[PDB]
Design a protein around this nucleic acid. Structure first.
Ligand code: MG
Ligand code: MG
Ligand code: MG
Ligand code: MG
Ligand code: MG
Ligand code: MG
Ligand code: MG
Ligand code: MG
Ligand code: MG
Ligand code: MG
Ligand code: MG
Ligand code: MG
Ligand code: MG
Ligand code: MG
Lengths: 99, 143, 167, 164, 258
RNA sequence: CAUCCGGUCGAUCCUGCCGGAGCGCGACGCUCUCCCCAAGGACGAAGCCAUGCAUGCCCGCUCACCGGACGCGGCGGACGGCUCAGGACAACGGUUGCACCCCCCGCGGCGGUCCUAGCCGGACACCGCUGGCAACCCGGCGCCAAGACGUGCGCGCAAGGGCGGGCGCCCGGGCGAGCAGCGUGACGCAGCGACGGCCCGCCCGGGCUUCCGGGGCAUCACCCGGUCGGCGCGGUCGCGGCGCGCCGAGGGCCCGACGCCUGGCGGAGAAUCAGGGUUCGACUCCGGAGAGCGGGCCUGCGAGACGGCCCGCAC
RNA sequence: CCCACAGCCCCCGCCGCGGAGCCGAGGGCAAGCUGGUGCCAGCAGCCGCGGUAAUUCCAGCUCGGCGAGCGUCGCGCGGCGCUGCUGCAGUUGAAACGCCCGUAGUUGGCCCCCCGCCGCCACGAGGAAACGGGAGCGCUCCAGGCAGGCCCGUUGGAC
RNA sequence: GAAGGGCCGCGAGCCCCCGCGCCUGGAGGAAGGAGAAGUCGUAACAAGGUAUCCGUAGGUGAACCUGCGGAUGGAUCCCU
């Protein structure tokens, strides 16, 4: 945990939406961004999955918005920790949300 | 319209062109790989082989002639081809079981002229250009 | 030899990455010390030449260590009797193998020689009047060549007592 | 590697896309006879240089007058053209450059300048004299027919002192 | 991957502001570690051979240096690859020439001749305060020098005057709004101006806004802002006062000199 | 630097392809007066190698022959040079970080060491005598030196370990960030010292790491099972399924997973030429990888090194 | 003179070797006269010529193109608006699924005067050169190189 | 403190089995293309002498014929 534990936040802060929350204290975060193609002068929508540690101080369900901070390698695929959660309402339609 | 034109549609356009540019005969012949594996010269300017039979081939219907050619076997492949020596009276300079250098015609791999099913040309025999032997610049007294 | 490079693993999708170089010396590992409690024989400590000329010492056999009673601020060197609990595995306990986090019994003489005369926690004193005191290991044998620790106090002591009492 | 690998190099001329064109052949032969050119590579060189100047002028003209880059580059280009004598002195606007033509380049060659000075009977005579090293520029002997003379050196061209 | 450190240096891979000819050779001198780093220094031989021209080859420079004919901050140096940096003292007693190494507006090293009164010291930038052995306060600078027991009033990014003979601090200039500075890195090397604004971003760089004497304004990061006094320079500076002319004026000056 | 022309008919207009016309890269063929610059066994043989050369220098240690030899010792040999086999969320390019790290020379500091000091001890090399073997290689005896080895004169000092802040949050040694240092109770005597260097900072370099980019085939549609996460120990310069034990079940996929193929090193860049683009990128600079194939290791700050050693296989 | 030693360039004296080939002449595509052979021999990238004038084969004459270079073979770009973002076509020439529902995907009328966020535009910092562009300089010119002049921006190598 | 031995770790080489990719022989069978001035008939183009074509099913030396339903690209833009 970044508050009661022994890790430090340093580097880049990012925002994303919750994609899955099945592991004990970990989640998968979805990030959305745009890619430009010069030949056609148009864009493509791309997304990536980023895993993070979720401390027991936060309650999170799918579709929520989270702020993640960079930490040292905590496992094979984890280098981020959750530091803020904003709830999202019920049955809200999935939307493309760059952040 | 018929073509997609939205601001976020680059992926579809790329995929459409990727799929559709395989319909050109030239693009396929170049970027597919079958021709390279089927061409006895494997993308080389010319090859070196051994002549094994001297033969004459008739021309097509509107013409009337017997063209002089030889059968060759490529050293680096061991396969068989037919190569044609054009210059007048140059068959007598080519002898059976002789080392030759064989190149292509003007067109990449199609038949040229009224010669049926022939795609190669003889240019050097025994190390001396045929064009030079025909003009009497040099002589083949080594053979 | 032994290595901890990640090139020989699988990817997060479960795919085989492939290998593009031979083994490197920065990414090497070594066989464990497996430090043993003594219970030709004596204290034996080896030395290891590590990267940068640095020196690392791993203990193979030892019998003593420094232990502290934090509440009363009492610290002495005591003899370790045997290992009685270990969370990782019971095989280590059977072999009396020393690692960080092992729960051990130490001799009570250095403490009882001066205690049993001042008001303090009842439980530690009851241990003192006996032959052994429950304790823990806090150092890393195999890296620093020592086995130090501290005397158990409250809730953790209750936890380990309830654990080992039925046995 | 050898230091000779970092030496640069480039071509200097262009060949026409359609070679067999009657009016072009006639004009080229006419110019060759008028200025006594050796081969047709010289005309191609002249066309190359003219194209470079015209492209620079176009790019500058596309921009606004009060563009700093426009002022800088136009000033340099005009100064070079004036110093070389290709463009008349009284013209100091970038528009005039696009009207220039290869004949203006030819008129500044050494053969031409010594012919208009009555120092040679003909372009062919001028070339023969230049080869034999009977001519000088500013007290220095020049034996290159295609050498181009700057305006400031026009009055300094004379016969070699040491020539017979 | 190389198995160890690098000892050579290709000429094409050398810094641009050294002004080395492409055809001089395959190799360039590799400076040795010292007061200044590779990209904020210039080897001694380059100054002694390609500028002042007192030598025409490597060997002559080697003899000159091993005969003790140049003093750097009061100490003779015999290394042809010794690195010379900003605000260094270059004295040659055999010809009574004394120079201070500074930056020109174009962004290159220059030798400003000096006097005897101001050659007994140098200016240093303090960028790190730390506790050493036994908790003893320490202080480091841009020329790889450490001083024990500094005054508590001295903070980071300040500027320090030290006597060459004795590494003792005399007076110090604080980093504050309204102090003349000199830019020592980036696109604006050699410019002189006064601080007008300071803006900090948590976890990232701190940007400094400076105004030149003529009213021009420019920005740069704090990592290459050097204080050189209190509203007036403490040392002699080049003939020009940190004014970078535009391409037009430089072309006019070139034509005039032609 | 915005160009077209010939060919289906008894004649005509179209679609549509075939062919010509230009530039560049190589090979073949004819020919060749003078000067300047200049590439050069890369192209499904990273196939095989007689012959010669490619890494030495020197401060210390001279009863050697007449100080030059030789040897011990020190520095260097991990740079440079060659090639592109292998490797397709990798390498590489730009952008972060180590509050998870190591570092020779050099520059600047600092320099207190628990319990015969007009100068300690024993050896080896070269060399002398005696010898083995085809060669390569060495044996035994014997006097002698050190800035070599060992011991070590001295004001307490290496690693590690326990205890030492708050009361909703924010408003000096140092930070954006409770990070450093110190005290104190116990352990242990590491390094320096027979002409004084242990330690600290900077510098170059390295290791890993965030974000974005990073070949083709759907006649490959479902894939992974240390695979995904958690707890604990170990090992490592160091974080980490890196390894082991236990627990849970997860992770990726038409925004194309997984698999297969490549006559696949990447980038800075090259060719072509209205504008928009297409193709290439063995080779000059940077970075990576290798030294017949596959593995292992010593020395050392630094090599899993091959003009260093050990093994198997093919020669 | 230069060069580690020698050539080479350049300068000074006495004698003084002045040498053009490769392709083509029906069209595309600039350029025609006798003698042979007789759908044979051969030419011809394509159209085509040759069965008694062969304007096309083999020879002589003449003529044209480029030129110390010319021609042939293979590959890439262009030609090609015949891969089409700019910018093709889809009644009959090749090509609109037999029709409907429908998820991913793509696309979505009008309206609030200023606040926050994403894209967008402009400016800036930061980060290797070489290459490319480009300022100045008569290597005799040039391909090049960063030189160089005396009474030099602090001579210059800017960007 | 040597030779030597035991257990674990890194891991070559050989044997056995499985799978993947690229080439390749083969009696006989069957397709396509070219070459010539071969034999048997005339299916299509005119109402081509039974209008042509599409789908489906059966039959016949060969082209093809017939049955059910459809189209005009027909030989009809025209009738309480
Ligand atoms: Mg002592
Ligand atoms: Mg000693
Ligand atoms: Mg490869
Ligand atoms: Mg390289
Ligand atoms: Mg290697
Ligand atoms: Mg090796
Ligand atoms: Mg070798
Ligand atoms: Mg080597
Ligand atoms: Mg079309
Ligand atoms: Mg039809
Ligand atoms: Mg149709
Ligand atoms: Mg009929
Ligand atoms: Mg009928
Ligand atoms: Mg009909």
């Amino acid at each position: 945990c970044p508050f009661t534990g022994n890790v430090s936040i340093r580097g880049r802060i990012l925002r994303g939406v919750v994609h899955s929350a099945k592991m004990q204290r970990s989640i998968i975060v979805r990030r959305d961004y745009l890619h430009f193609v010069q030949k056609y002068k148009r864009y493509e929508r791309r997304h990536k999955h980023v895993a993070a540690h979720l401390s027991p101080c936060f309650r999170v369900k799918e579709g929520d918005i989270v702020t993640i901070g960079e930490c040292r390698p905590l496992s094979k695929t984890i280098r981020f920790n959750v530091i803020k959660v904003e709830p999202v309402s019920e049955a809200a339609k999935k939307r493309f949300s760059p952040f | 319209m018929s073509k997609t034109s939205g601001l976020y549609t680059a992926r579809k356009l790329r995929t459409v062109r990727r799929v559709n540019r395989w319909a050109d005969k030239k693009y396929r012949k170049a970027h597919l790989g079958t021709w390279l594996k089927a061409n006895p010269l494997e993308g080389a300017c010319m090859a070196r082989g051994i002549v094994t039979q001297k033969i004459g081939i008739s021309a097509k219907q509107p013409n009337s002639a017997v063209r002089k050619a030889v059968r060759v076997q490529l050293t680096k492949n061991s396969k068989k081809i037919t190569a044609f020596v054009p210059r007048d009276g140059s068959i007598t300079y080519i002898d059976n079981n002789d080392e030759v250098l064989v190149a292509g015609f003007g067109r990449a791999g199609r038949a040229v002229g009224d010669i049926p099913g022939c795609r190669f040309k003889v240019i050097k025999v025994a190390g001396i250009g045929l064009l030079a032997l025909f003009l009497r610049k040099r002589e083949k007294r080594a053979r | 030899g032994i290595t901890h490079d990640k090139m020989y693993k699988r990817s997060k999708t479960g795919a085989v990455q492939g290998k593009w170089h031979k083994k490197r010396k920065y990414n090497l590992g070594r066989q464990p010390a497996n430090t043993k409690l003594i219970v030709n024989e004596g204290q034996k400590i080896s030395t290891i030449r590590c990267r940068g000329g640095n020196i690392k010492r791993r203990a193979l056999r030892l019998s003593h260590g420094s232990f502290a009673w934090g509440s009363a601020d009492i610290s002495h060197k005591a003899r370790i009797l045997q290992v009685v609990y270990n969370s990782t595995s019971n095989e280590l306990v059977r072999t009396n193998t020393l690692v960080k986090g092992c729960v051990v019994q130490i001799d009570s003489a250095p403490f009882k020689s001066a205690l049993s005369n001042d008001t303090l926690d009842k439980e530690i004193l009851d241990q003192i009047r006996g032959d052994h005191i429950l304790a823990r290991i806090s150092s890393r044998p195999g890296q620093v060549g020592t086995a130090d620790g501290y005397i158990l106090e409250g809730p953790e002591l209750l936890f380990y007592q309830k654990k080992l009492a039925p046995k | 590697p050898r230091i000779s690998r970092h030496r640069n190099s480039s071509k200097t001329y262009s060949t026409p896309k359609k070679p067999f064109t009657k009016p072009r052949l006639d004009a080229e032969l006419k110019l060759c006879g008028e200025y006594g050119l050796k081969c047709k590579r010289e005309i191609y060189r002249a066309r190359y240089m003219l194209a470079k100047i015209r492209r620079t002028a176009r790019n500058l003209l596309t921009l606004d007058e009060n563009d700093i880059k426009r002022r800088f580059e136009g000033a340099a280009l005009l100064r070079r053209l004036h110093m070389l004598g290709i463009l008349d002195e009284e013209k100091d606007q970038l528009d005039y450059v696009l009207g220039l033509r290869i004949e203006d380049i030819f008129k500044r060659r050494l053969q031409s300048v010594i012919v208009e000075s009555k120092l040679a009977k003909s372009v062919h005579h001028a070339r023969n004299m230049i080869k034999a090293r009977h001519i000088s520029v500013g007290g220095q002997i020049v034996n290159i027919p295609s050498y181009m003379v700057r305006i400031s050196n026009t009055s300094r061209v004379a016969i070699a002192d040491t020539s017979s | 991957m190389a198995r160890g450190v690098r000892k050579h240096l290709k000429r094409l891979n050398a810094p641009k502001h050294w002004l080395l000819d492409k055809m001089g050779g395959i190799w360039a001198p590799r400076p040795t570690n010292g007061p200044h780093g590779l990209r904020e220094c210039i080897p001694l031989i380059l100054i002694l051979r390609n500028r002042l021209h007192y030598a025409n080859t490597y060997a002559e420079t080697s003899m000159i240096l091993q005969d003790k004919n140049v003093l750097i901050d009061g100490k003779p140096r015999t290394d042809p690859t010794f690195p010379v940096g900003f605000m260094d003292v270059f004295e040659i007693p055999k010809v009574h020439k004394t120079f201070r190494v500074l930056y020109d507006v174009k962004g290159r090293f220059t030798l400003v001749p000096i006097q005897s009164n101001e050659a007994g010291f140098k200016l240093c930038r303090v960028q790190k305060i730390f506790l050493g052995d036994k908790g003893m306060p320490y202080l480091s600078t841009h020329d790889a020098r450490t001083i024990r027991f500094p005054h508590p009033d001295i903070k980071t990014n300040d500027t320090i005057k030290i006597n060459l003979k004795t590494g003792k601090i005399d007076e110090w200039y604080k980093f504050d709004i309204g102090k003349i500075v000199m830019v020592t890195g980036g696109r604006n090397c050699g410019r002189i101006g006064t601080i007008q604004a300071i803006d900090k971003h948590m976890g990232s760089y701190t940007m400094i806004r400076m105004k030149d004497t003529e009213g021009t304004e420019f920005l740069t990061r704090l990592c290459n802002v050097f204080v050189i006094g209190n509203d007036s320079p403490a040392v002699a500076i080049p003939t020009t006062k940190g004014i970078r002319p535009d391409i037009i004026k430089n072309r006019e000056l070139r034509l005039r000199s032609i």
